[PDB]
Structure 1
Amino acid sequence: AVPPTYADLGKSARDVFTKGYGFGLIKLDLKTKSENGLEFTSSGSANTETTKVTGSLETKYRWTEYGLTFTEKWNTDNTLGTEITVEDQLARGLKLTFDSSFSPNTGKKNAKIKTGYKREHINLGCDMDFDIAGPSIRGALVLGYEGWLAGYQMNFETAKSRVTQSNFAVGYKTDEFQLHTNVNDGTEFGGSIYQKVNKKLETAVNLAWTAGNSNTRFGIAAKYQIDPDACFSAKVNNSSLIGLGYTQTLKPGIKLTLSALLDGKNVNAGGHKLGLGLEFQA
């Protein structure tokens, strides 16, 4: 039941590739849960290469009285964003999302409507983007029976012409084996496999192929937790890229993560990309 959506389809492998290391960036997040319903998150990203300071304050209002969720975010470039989520209002698996962005300093507005239908094995989703440049409509439908799953994504724009962007993603998802192949307009061909040998060993393999210039690139990643608080991550790319990350829980909420990407050669040309991450949860 509840088949995976298009964005979530394969998100395990990308998340393994994404989460774990943030070299070149400084991670600083604080999450706070209140007693009744209040959620507060303050995250701060610091860059040493570009010397940039980025951050967002995110306030979450979980209302189970009617299924309403109120989210308000604030960035550093004077951008204001509000979001309303309604789930299980009158239908079975209907979800309505309203996202709005407005700037007080200058004047700029953007709108986004998300709609989601979830059923026994049928997943429907429609995103309508309202902007001055041009409205766009994007629909993703996922169908599967037991383990065989296939999803279709389409993107259409009324501003220019009959532009249509096709996406066909076919995969096999089960308890410990997860394989997924994504096809973009018969041009992009991606294949991700992810498996778990034990409760401590995780392996992932990614392949990318194209029909235009016949470019092929593959990469493998391993994740292993020595202890419930100590974890290690390694990733190797096709050409020479190697990345190592190590995470350890220091205080019962405080965790420290270290990331290092090495690009070195033997012709006197080498480079290090380091990154520190630290978060607090309350």
Structure 2
Amino acid sequence: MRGSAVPPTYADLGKSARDVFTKGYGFGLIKLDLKTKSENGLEFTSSGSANTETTKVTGSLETKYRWTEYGLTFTEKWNTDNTLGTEITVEDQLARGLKLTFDSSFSPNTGKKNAKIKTGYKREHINLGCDMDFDIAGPSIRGALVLGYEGWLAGYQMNFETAKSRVTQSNFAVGYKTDEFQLHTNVNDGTEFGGSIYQKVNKKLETAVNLAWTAGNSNTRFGIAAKYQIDPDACFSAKVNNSSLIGLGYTQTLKPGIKLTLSALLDGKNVNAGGHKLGLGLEFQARS
């Protein structure tokens, strides 16, 4: 097939991860997420998470607004406890161009109130972000020099913090994009080696493999993932790690707007190391 010639930095990092997250809603925690909407142009999103199985009860409900086809889009992701913030999306036009965003991200109480301006300009074979975090005391400056090329790609990330200190922790990675495949290698800052590889030979059959080598002389952790986009509204997972993780994701769809996803992890029968805990996912939707 083909696709495009852009993709930012979170590329293969997120396409395989979303592919890695498919392992149900968390390894062990219930999250009934209900999505709504209104024709008046007002999008909605109510949610109720129960992380750590029962080691924490949290509720998170947000509001989304879409303004004009050319205008902008405001995301008021409020909360219940908790914290808040907002988003102002800037688009030049359908023809991509540059797209600026504003974060009203802040700290409710006992927190460090700090928003920021996430920038980003794209085009043919390239796209760099100007993500700026103007936080408390010392502001942080993010960057990214992603480079395009005919079925070839090379990325570069720089992270600035504090006004006195110029550099903090910047990583650089490489790899090229391919017709339905994605291969890259991440080189985290601080001396770290690692990479990932997506392989899609079928729409009903999907695969991927991750792994990273830690400098020094350290051992090695593996990662074998795979999902079969089963014809019926129900796909699963092959979440098997060679490092020491043996779990599996089971995604399930139950027609209209309601979907139930269940997954679990089994690390043998450890006592002081780990055991077997399951995760639950619920999805209540609507029309309105």
Provide the TM-score with structure 2 as the length reference.
Answer: 0.87
Residues 265 and 115 (structure 1 numbering): CA distance in 2 closer, same or farther, change over 3 Å? Answer: same
Does the 8 A contact of 1:115 with 1:125 survive in 2? yes
Alpha carbons 2:220, 2:243 under 8 Å: kept: no
**Quick check: 1:13–1:192 contact (8 Å CA) kept in 2?**
no
Task: Answer whether contact 1:10 1:192 (CA < 8 A) is retained.
Answer: no
Give the direction of change, closer, same or farther, for the CA distance of 1:69–1:21 in structure 2 (3 Å limit).
Answer: closer
Distance 2:65 2:273 in 1: 51
The offset of 1:50, in angstroms, is 5.0
In the TM superposition, what is the alpha-carbon distance from 1:121 to its structure 2 partner? 1.3
Per-residue deviation, residues 138-197 of structure 1 (Å, max 9, x unmatched): 110111121101111101123452334232111121123211101123711111111122
Shift of 1:115: 0.9
Number of aligned pairs? 282
Matched, 1:270 2:239: no
Residues 203 and 221 in structure 1, CA contact (< 8 A), matched pair in contact too = yes
Whether 1:136 and 2:149 are equivalent positions in the alignment is no
CA distance in 2, matches of 1:25, 1:242: 18
Distance 1:207 1:85, change over 3 A: same
Shift of 1:106: 5.6
Does the Cα contact within 8 Å between 1:113 and 1:128 map onto a contact in 2? yes
Residue 112 of structure 1, CA deviation: 0.8
Structure 1 range deviating more: 116-125 or 183-192: 183-192
Match of 2:255 in 1: 251
Matched with 2:41 is: 37
The structure 1 residue matched to 2:29, chosen from 6, 22, 25, is: 25
Alpha-carbon distance, 1:256 to partner: 1.1
C-alpha distance 270-117 of structure 1, shift in aligned 2 (>3 A): closer
Indicate the residue corresponding to 1:127 in structure 2.
131
Distance 1:152 1:75 in 2: 35
Q: How far apart are the structure 1 equivalents of 2:11 and 2:81? A: 28
Seen in structure 2, the aligned counterparts of structure 1 residues 49 and 278 have a Cα distance that, compared at 3 Å, is closer
2:194, 2:212 within 8 Å by CA — same for their partners in 1?
yes
Q: Quick one: structure 1 residues 69 and 19, their matched pair in 2 at CA, closer, same or farther if it must change by over 3 Å? A: farther
Moved more, 214-223 or 106-115: 106-115
Q: How far did 1:281 drift?
A: 2.4
Q: 1:8 to 1:34 in 2, by over 3 A?
A: farther
Q: 2:23–2:248: 8 Å Cα contact kept in structure 1? A: no
Inter-CA distance 136–252: structure 2 relative to 1 (3 Å threshold): same
Gap runs ≥5 in structure 1 = none
In structure 2, relative to structure 1, the CA distance for the partners of 1:210 and 1:107 (3 Å cut) is closer
Q: Any idea what the Cα deviations from partners look like across 1:214-261, whole Å, max 9, x if unmatched?
A: 231111012113323121112111243211222222242211111110
Relative distance call for 1:250 and 1:3 in structure 2 (3 A) is closer
Q: Partners of 2:245 and 2:258 in 1: how far apart? A: 30
Aligned partner of 1:211 in structure 2 is 215
Deviation of 1:91 (Å): 9.5
Q: CA RMSD in A?
A: 2.7
Q: Displacement, 1:44?
A: 1.1
2: distance between equivalents of 1:243 and 1:90? 42
Point out where structure 2 has 5 or more consecutive residues left out of the alignment.
none
After superposition, the Cα gap between the structure-2 partners of 1:120 and 1:16, relative to the gap in structure 1 and judged at 3 Å, is same
- Report % sequence identity: 100
* CA distance, structure 1, for counterparts of residue 43 and residue 110 of structure 2: 29
SS in 1 for 2:16: helix
Q: TM-score, normalised on structure 1?
A: 0.89
Q: Deviations over 1:105-124 (max 9, x none)?
A: 56752111111111111212
Q: Is the 8 A contact 1:148 1:172 kept in 2?
A: yes
Q: Tell me how far 1:209 sits from its aligned partner.
A: 0.4
Moved more, 266-275 or 80-89: 266-275
TM-superposition CA deviations, 1:29-49 (whole Å, max 9, x none):
111122131110011111354
